[PDB]
Every structure is written in structure tokens, then in C-alpha cells.
Amino acid sequence: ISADQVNQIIYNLHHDPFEILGCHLLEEGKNTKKWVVRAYLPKAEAAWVIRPTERKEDPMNSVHHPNFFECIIETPELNHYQLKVKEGEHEKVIYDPYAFSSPYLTDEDIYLFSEGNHHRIYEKLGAHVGEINGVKGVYFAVWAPNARNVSVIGDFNNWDGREHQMRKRNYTIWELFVPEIGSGTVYKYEIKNSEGHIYEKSDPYGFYREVRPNTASIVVDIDNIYQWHDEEWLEKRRNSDPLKQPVSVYEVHLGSWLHGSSAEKMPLLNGEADPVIVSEWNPGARFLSYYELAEKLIPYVKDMGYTHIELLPIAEHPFDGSWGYQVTGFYSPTSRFGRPEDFMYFVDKCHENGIGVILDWVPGHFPKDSHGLAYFDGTHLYEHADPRIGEHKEWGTLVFNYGRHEVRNFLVANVLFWFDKYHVDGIRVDAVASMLYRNYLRKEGEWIANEYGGDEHIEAVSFIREVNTLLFEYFPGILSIAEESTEWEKVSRPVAAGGLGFNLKWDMGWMHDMLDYFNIDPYFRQYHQNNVTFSMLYYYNENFMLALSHDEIVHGKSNMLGKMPGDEWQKYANVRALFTYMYTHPGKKTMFMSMEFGQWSEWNVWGDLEWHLLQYEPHQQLKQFFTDLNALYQQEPALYTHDFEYHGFEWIDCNDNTHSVVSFLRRSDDPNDSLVVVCNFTPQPHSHYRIGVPEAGYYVELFNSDAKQYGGSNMGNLGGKWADEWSFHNKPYSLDLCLPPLAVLILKLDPTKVP
Ligand SMILES: [Mg+2]
Ligand SMILES: [Mg+2]
Ligand SMILES: [Mg+2]
Ligand SMILES: [Mg+2]
Numbered sequence: 001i002s003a004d005q006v007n008q009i010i011y012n013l014h015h016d017p018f019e020i021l022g023c024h025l026l027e028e029g030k031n032t033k034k035w036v037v038r039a040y041l042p043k044a045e046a047a048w049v050i051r052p053t054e055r056k057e058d059p060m061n062s063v064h065h066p067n068f069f070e071c072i073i074e075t076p077e078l079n080h081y082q083l084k085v086k087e088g089e090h091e092k093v094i095y096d097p098y099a100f101s102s103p104y105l106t107d108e109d110i111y112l113f114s115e116g117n118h119h120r121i122y123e124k125l126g127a128h129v130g131e132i133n134g135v136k137g138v139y140f141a142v143w144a145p146n147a148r149n150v151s152v153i154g155d156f157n158n159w160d161g162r163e164h165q166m167r168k169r170n171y172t173i174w175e176l177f178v179p180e181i182g183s184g185t186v187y188k189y190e191i192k193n194s195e196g197h198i199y200e201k202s203d204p205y206g207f208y209r210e211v212r213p214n215t216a217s218i219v220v221d222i223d224n225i226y227q228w229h230d231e232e233w234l235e236k237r238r239n240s241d242p243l244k245q246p247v248s249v250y251e252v253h254l255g256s257w258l259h260g261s262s263a264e265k266m267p268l269l270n271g272e273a274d275p276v277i278v279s280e281w282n283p284g285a286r287f288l289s290y291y292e293l294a295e296k297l298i299p300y301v302k303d304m305g306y307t308h309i310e311l312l313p314i315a316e317h318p319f320d321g322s323w324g325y326q327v328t329g330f331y332s333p334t335s336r337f338g339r340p341e342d343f344m345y346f347v348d349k350c351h352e353n354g355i356g357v358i359l360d361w362v363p364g365h366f367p368k369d370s371h372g373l374a375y376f377d378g379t380h381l382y383e384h385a386d387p388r389i390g391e392h393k394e395w396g397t398l399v400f401n402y403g404r405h406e407v408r409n410f411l412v413a414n415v416l417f418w419f420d421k422y423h424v425d426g427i428r429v430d431a432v433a434s435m436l437y438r439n440y441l442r443k444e445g446e447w448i449a450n451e452y453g454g455d456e457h458i459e460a461v462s463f464i465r466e467v468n469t470l471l472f473e474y475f476p477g478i479l480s481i482a483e484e485s486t487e488w489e490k491v492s493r494p495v496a497a498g499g500l501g502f503n504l505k506w507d508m509g510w511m512h513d514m515l516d517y518f519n520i521d522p523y524f525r526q527y528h529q530n531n532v533t534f535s536m537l538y539y540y541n542e543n544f545m546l547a548l549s550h551d552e553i554v555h556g557k558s559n560m561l562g563k564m565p566g567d568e569w570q571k572y573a574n575v576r577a578l579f580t581y582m583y584t585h586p587g588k589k590t591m592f593m594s595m596e597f598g599q600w601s602e603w604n605v606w607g608d609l610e611w612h613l614l615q616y617e618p619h620q621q622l623k624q625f626f627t628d629l630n631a632l633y634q635q636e637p638a639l640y641t642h643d644f645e646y647h648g649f650e651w652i653d654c655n656d657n658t659h660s661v662v663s664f665l666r667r668s669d670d671p672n673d674s675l676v677v678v679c680n681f682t683p684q685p686h687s688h689y690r691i692g693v694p695e696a697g698y699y700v701e702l703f704n705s706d707a708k709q710y711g712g713s714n715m716g717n718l719g720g721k722w723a724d725e726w727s728f729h730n731k732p733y734s735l736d737l738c739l740p741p742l743a744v745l746i747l748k749l750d751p752t753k754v755p
Contacts, residue, residue: 001038006064009040022098023078035078037096039069039085046086049073050093052473053080053119079112080119082474092231093238095120095420103130103139104177110170113143116405119470120420121413122331125173126205127219129182137179138219140187142203143172143406144377147191150174153200154187154216161190172406183221186210188371193378202329202371204410209316211276211335215328215371222421226344230351230423237356237425237477243503243543246633246640247479247588249358250306250596251549255287255320255336257297257593259608262286268338269345276336279320279606290333290342294349302353304596304623305630308479309350310358310428312550314343318369323550323605325430326397327362328372330414333422347423356425358479359418363411363467364434365397374398382407388448389457392434394441402435403459408466415467419475426479427471432500433486435460461500468501479504481545492542504588507544510535515552518578521565522660522682522742529657532681536649539586543644546582547590553603561598570683572598572618573712573742576625576705577681580744583629584639584666584677586649596626621711628710632703632746637668638675652676652692653729659684661739663691663729675702676747678737685715686739692729698722698753699735706740715740720747722755 001020008014009021017040026034037049039060047060049071060069060083084093105124112118113125128139140152150168151161156178166174166189174189188200202209206217255278265272266289275286288296301309316329324334333343350357366382368374373382383398384390390399401407418424434440438457439447450458468480482502484491493499517531553559564574575598583589594609597619601610613619633639642648652663660681667674676693680686693699700720706712721735728734737745 001063001070003064006068009068010065018098018101022096022101023081026072029074032074032076033078034072034074037071037073037078037081037083039083039096039098040067041069041083041085042067043087044069044085045088047071048084050082050084051075051078051080052082053470055473057084079108079117090231091235093234100124103128103132105141105169105173105175110173113406113409114170114172116408116412118409119413119416119474121409122205122417126203126207126331127185127187127217129219129221129224132177135179136182137177138181138185139175139177140166140189140203141173141175142166142189142205144174144189144191144381145172146194146377146379146381147174148194148196148378149192151190152176152178152187153190154185156181156185156187181219183219183225185219186216187219188216191377195378197378199370201376204373204376205331206329208332208340209329209335212316212318212320215318217329217332220340222340225339225341226348228344228348228423230348233351233354234423238475240477242426242477242479243644244641246307247504247545248306248583248630248633249308249310249545249547249588249590250301250304251310251312251547251590251592252297253312253323253550253593253603253605254293254314254334256603256605256608257293258288258611259285260288260292266338267291269342273338282607285608287336289338290346291338293337294342294346298346298349298353298355301355304627305634306355307634308356308358308425310426310590311360313360313362315362318367318371320605322367324360325362326365326367328367328369330410331417344422351423356479357423358426358428358481359424361415361418361427361429363400363415363429363463364431365392365395365399367397382410386448388442388446389438392441399435401459402457402463408463411463412467412470415471416474419471419478424478426481428479428481428483429502430483432464432482432484432491433488435464436484436488437486464500465495469495472501472503481506483508483547489541492544503543504545505542506547506549506590507535507539507542507587509538510544510546510587511548511552514578514582515548515563517681518574519563519565522570525660525681526657529654529660529662532660532662532679533651533654536586536651540644540646544587545590546585546587548582548592548595549590550592550603553592553594555602557602559599559602560595561600566683568618569711570742572622573683573706575622576710576712577679577742577744579626580629580703580705580746581679583633584664584675584744584746586643586666588643589633597623618711621709625705625710629703636673636675636702636748637670638666638673641668642666652731659686661686661689665694672749672751674749676735676745678739678745678747680739680741680743683741685741686737689737689739690726690728690734691737692727692731692734693723693747693749694731694733695749695751696723696725696733697749697751698755699747700750700753701745702748703746704740704743705745706743712743713741715743716745720750 060071203217207220208218313324384401490499513531564571708714723733
């Protein structure tokens with residue numbers, strides 16, 4: 001490029017910067033092409049072009065001006081890239097602001113979508129504010145290849161689409177530009193199918209939706225509604241390995257954490273709306289907005305000390321009682337809690353407080369509701385036509401045709417969408433087995449095998465691998481968490497190693513072992529010592545997340561206290577011992593709202609949590625317990641640097657079944673960060689109990705779950721204990737401990753202590 005062209009850009013004299021900025025073809029070779037990407041990045045000193053799907057990165061060079069950059073790249077196609085931009089000591093990664101010169105679908109967009117590889121399809125499908133032929137308006141586009149006709153109906157034409165019939169492009173996608181309407185427009189698509197039947201559909205790629213049970217889509221100017229402040233969070237994430245950090249997740253169902261009064265409006269970020277009543281049977285209650293949740297949930301979490309919030313599915317869903325797991329509006333955060341920019345504000349405020357956001361994401365199925373994706377164009381479009389692979393009959397839902405390119409693309413791009421537009425830090429996928437098996441919840445003679453005779457759902461395995469390949473290329477540093485309940489192998493291993501590409505898997509066997517164990521009367525736990533220790537046998541086959549989830553405190557299973565035997569003191573003590581063990585056992589941690597304050601009743605998705613319990617000392621003490629435990633977890637490297645290496649854990653003794661006592665070490669990089677953990681899972685105290693330790697010296701009692709401030713009896717070692725030169729458990733030194741009842745101790749060598 002010339003200096004004159006540069007200067008035109010720098011001084012805002014150029015007639016159309018898209019002519020120069022963005023990605024432009026320079027030449028075509030025999031087997032490749034030469035491209036330039038240009039960027040004007042005021043205040044940046046350096047920039048790179050990332051091609052995350054090829055795992056490449058090329059520096060950009062300043063050209064004529066220190067803030068004007070170019071990068072020449074040879075490759076057959078340059079569809080997928082990001083700009084990494086350094087301003088002083090800080091780096092951000094963004095999509096190219098000049099990527100798309102027009103709001104309409106190009107030939108190239110259509111080709112990539114036809115092939116299943118348009119990672120940014122949601123920039124063109126759906127509804128977008130823009131300009132065509134000189135006039136501002138909204139561009140609508142929808143995939144419906146077998147429809148006979150499609151029209152845009154909405155507020156702007158009183159729901160009569162005769163003058164807003166769409167144009168079909170390439171036998172596949174319908175479009176229309178509507179001048180002089182903007183964000184806030186309410187609409188649907190009116191489709192006529194091959195039989196002549198006329199019906200109404202919400203926008204599959206819609207960005208916002210009326211409040212259930214209404215279903216019209218609403219136009220959002222998604223790139224001009226919110227100003228983020230989380231660049232430093234996003235930089236640290238991208239440059240860190242979350243597997244080597246503390247990860248303690250507070251799992252939350254937004255609709256049922258806390259309710260407000262329906263006698264007032266729902267406040268929004270700089271605005272308000274009518275209240276959304278929780279149900280017809282509880283009409284005095286409304287949901288809190290994303291905005292109110294930012295102001296209330298986030299400081300609550302921060303003070304408790306969790307590193308992450310995990311949300312039950314926030315994608316738009318018609319029935320509260322599905323908990324969000326039957327989604328019909330995959331590209332919009334539920335309108336129960338306000339607008340897209342209110343959820344953006346929630347995430348930005350998490351990041352300001354140093355808290356990450358994990359979304360439960362639901363690619364496995366979708367419900368039959370007629371506004372949604374089902375039978376979209378008068379054919380089996382999103383779902384597979386064969387009910388043996390396209391329906392989950394026991395659930396009454398439909399299963400995506402993962403082999404069909406445009407369906408694969410809908411979902412792959414949807415996962416990316418949440419990380420792009422809403423800056424989330426992770427996803428969690430429930431019931432991964434439901435996708436992986438062609439015989440899932442199907443009787444003999446009612447499913448068919450794959451092309452090799454097996455039960456593996458090949459197309460679904462390929463989709464999962466593609467999702468996780470792409471996610472980590474575009475957004476390194478994120479969490480991709482699976483729950484897979486059939487011992488499918490290598491769930492949390494890289495795709496190139498034959499895995500499914502997740503980086504963490506819920507340890508469901510661990511969860512069952514613990515909750516079954518703790519539910520046993522303590523005298524009988526001697527017959528089930530193996531529940532305590534067994535999960536360490538397979539532990540290194542995956543990267544495990546230790547999750548005690550929402551699913552465990554519903555349907556007659558009781559809340560945590562209710563699972564435990566004994567009198568009220570012992571029930572609390574059991575909860576503290578279980579969770580101290582959980583936080584000291586190798587693996588990352590997840591627990592569900594209400595567990596941290598000892599709610600007695602099961603989680604009820606139709607009400608809110610029993611916050612009044614925190615008026616009382618025992619609940620307050622348990623909450624302080626969790627606060628201190630989260631703090632300890634973040635403060636002790638041996639609890640998080642080596643979760644997934646043999647070095648990070650070793651049993652000291654796990655053979656005393658007759659007293660339900662086990663002990664173990666956790667280690668990190670520094671040998672002085674080693675921790676000694678001792679568990680007593682009966683109510684019998686022990687005044688002298690010997691445990692082998694690896695070094696001489698004074699072992700401080702760093703944590704004790706029987707402390708009086710946690711509701712315990714305050715038994716313990718009065719600060720700590722000198723090791724004896726007295727070999728035990730095959731170690732040269734040993735501690736003569738007092739073990740409190742139904743309690744866990746954590747001890748740590750203070751090598752500077754005065755003898
Ligand atoms: Mg009509
Ligand atoms: Mg399940
Ligand atoms: Mg057993
Ligand atoms: Mg309530």
C-alpha cells in the first residue's frame with residue numbers, strides 16, 4: 001500500500017476503509033493464494049494475524065505509520081483468522097473489524113455454510129442492522145431449503161407478510177432487507193411448506209426473544225449495545241493453563257437462586273422492564289434480571305471464594321421446568337432475566353471480580369415445540385428423518401442430524417458464538433452418552449448399527465471432536481467439561497490422541513461413591529472403605545472434575561444435610577468432612593447453590609433458595625466453613641498445581657477400615673508446600689493416632705473441620721504438632737495426632753519454626 005492511502009486512513013479522509021482494511025486477495029498461484037490483511041490500530045505497537053484453525057501466527061508489520069499494519073500470507077483460503085493487538089504491556093485477541101464489508105450473504109458465505117465450515121455464520125443468518133442500497137434497515141436471512149415460500153412477519157407490517165416475501169438464494173437460504181426498521185423489531189418467519197401448509201417460526205439465529213410463553217424474535221444490534229472492560233481477564237485466561245489453577249465452581253440456576261417482588265418493575269442496566277412472574281401459582285414473585293444478579297450474585301460468590309460460576313442453560317427455552325435443558329432459541333440468552341446487554345454486563349462484572357463463567361450448553365437435542373427448530377421447512381431439517389437416530393423417545397425430543405453440514409454448522413458456530421459475543425470462559429455438556437451411542441435408551445430391534453457394525457454414533461463423535469478442536473484453537477485457556485456416564489474412554493484427552501477433546505470430565509463414580517458412603521451409618525462405614533479409595537484407581541485416565549451437582553439434590557434424594565445419618569450435630573459434621581475431603585482429593589471442584597449454607601429442603605426450580613436459614617448460627621457457620629475452605633484452596637499450591645500428575649498425591653495409610661480413617665499427601669513444585677491430610681469418618685475421636693510424615697519438623701494444623709467457628713466441637717492439636725523420629729507408614733517420621741470426630745485435618749510443615 002502507498003503512504004497516501006495510509007494517510008487517508010489515519011486522517012479519516014478515505015472514502016471507504018473496507019477497500020484497504022481487512023483481508024484482500026493479492027494473487028492466485030497454482031496451489032495457493034497470496035492475501036494481505038491490513039489493520040489500523042491506533043495506540044497499538046505491534047500486531048499479529050492468528051490462523052487458529054491452522055495453528056499459525058504471523059507478525060504484522062507497520063507500514064508508513066506506526067499504527068497501520070499489514071501482513072502478507074499465502075494459503076489457499078483465508079476464511080478464519082483473528083488479530084492479536086499489543087498496546088503497551090497488554091495484548092487482546094479480536095476478530096477483524098473489517099472482516100465483512102456487507103450485511104448480505106456473499107457467495108463465499110453460502111459456500112462455506114454449505115460445507116459446514118462457516119464459523120461466523122451468525123453474522124449473516126438471523127437479523128442484522130445494516131445498510132443496503134444506501135438505506136439503513138435490517139437484513140433477515142434463514143436456511144429453509146424445502147420451503148415453498150417464506151415471509152417476514154412482525155410488528156412493522158401488522159403480522160402480514162405479503163409485501164415482505166423473502167428471496168430464495170442458491171436453492172437454500174431466504175433473505176430480505178427491510179428498510180427503516182431497527183433494533184427492537186419483533187418478528188417471525190412465515191413459512192409455507194411443500195404441501196402448502198402455512199406456519200410461524202421463531203428465528204433459529206435470533207439474538208433476543210419475547211418472554212416465554214410468547215416466542216417472537218427480536219432484532220438486536222449486538223455489536224453496539226455494550227462496552228466491555230475485561231481485556232485484562234481475557235489476556236490472562238488466554239495465557240494460562242486452567243488445569244494448573246484452582247477451579248472451584250458454584251453451580252447456579254439463574255431462575256431459582258433468588259426471586260424479587262412482582263409488585264415492581266425489573267431493573268435493567270440503565271433501564272427497566274415489566275416483571276417476569278415466576279409462575280401462576282406464585283404470582284407475587286418475579287425473576288431477578290441479569291443486571292440484579294450481577295449486583296447480588298457476583299459479590300456473594302466473590303465473598304464465598306469460588307473461582308467460577310457455572311450456569312444451568314441460559315439459552316432461550318420455553319418451559320421453566322426443563323431447567324433450561326430443552327432449548328428452542330440457541331442464539332439468545334433467555335429473556336426471563338432481561339436483555340442481551342444485561343447478560344453481557346453480568347459476564348463483564350464477573351471478570352472484573354476475577355470470576356469465570358461456565359455455560360451449560362445443550363447440543364444433544366431439542367424439543368418439539370412448533371415455534372422451534374422441529375420439522376423446520378416441512379422436512380426433517382435439523383433433526384434426522386429416521387426416528388431410530390433422530391428422536392429420543394423416552395424424552396419426547398428430537399436429535400440433531402450431526403452429519404448434515406448446515407446443522408453441524410448451526411451448532412459449531414453456536415458454541416463459538418457464546419465465547420465471541422458474550423466472553424464466556426467455559427462450557428459444560430450434560431449427558432454426552434446421549435450423543436455418542438446409536439442405541440441410547442433404545443431397545444433391541446429399535447436402533448441400527450453404524451456402518452462398521454458398532455454402536456458408536458460416528459457423526460456425533462466427529463461433531464464433538466470438531467467443537468472441541470475449534471474451541472481451544474480460537475479461545476485457548478477455556479474449560480470444556482463433559483458429563484459422560486458410560487466409561488467411554490479418553491473423554492478429556494486431545495483429539496489428536498484419540499480423545500473427544502474436553503479438558504475435564506465429571507467424576508460421576510466418585511460422586512456416587514461419596515454420597516453413598518456418607519449416607520451409611522458411621523459404624524457401618526468399615527464395610528465400605530473401598531468407597532473412599534476406589535476412585536483413585538482410574539483417576540489418572542481422565543482429568544476429573546469432582547462435582548456434587550443440582551441433579552443430586554432433587555427427586556427424593558434430599559439436600560446434603562438430609563442425606564447424612566445421626567443427630568443434627570453429626571449431620572453438619574458429615575457435610576464438613578465430606579466437603580473437606582472433596583476439596584483435598586485430587587481434581588477440580590463443583591458444588592450447587594444451597595449446599596454452601598445447609599439448606600434442608602431439596603432444590604425446587606419453581607421457588608428460590610431458603611435464604612432465611614442464614615438468620616441462624618448453624619447455617620452461618622457452615623457458610624463460613626465454605627468461605628474458609630475456598631480461601632485455603634486458592635492459597636495452597638499443593639491443592640491445585642498437580643491435580644493431574646502422580647506427584648500431586650500419595651496415600652499415607654488407607655487400611656484402617658475398622659476406624660474409617662484415611663490419610664494422604666498432596667504436593668506441588670516446592671516440597672515445603674506439601675500437605676498432610678487426615679480424615680476421620682466416624683464420630684469417635686482419637687486422642688493419639690499416628691500418621692507417618694516425610695520430614696522432621698513442626699506440622700502446623702492449617703485446617704480443621706471440627707473448629708468451633710464451623711460448628712464443630714473444637715477438638716484438635718492446638719496449633720500443630722512436632723514430628724517424632726519414629727518410623728510409621730513407611731516413612732521415617734510420624735505425628736501423634738488428636739483426630740476430631742467426623743472431621744478432616746490439613747497439616748503443613750513450617751520449616752522455620754523454633755525448637
Ligand atoms: Mg397473513
Ligand atoms: Mg443425567
Ligand atoms: Mg460397594
Ligand atoms: Mg423463597
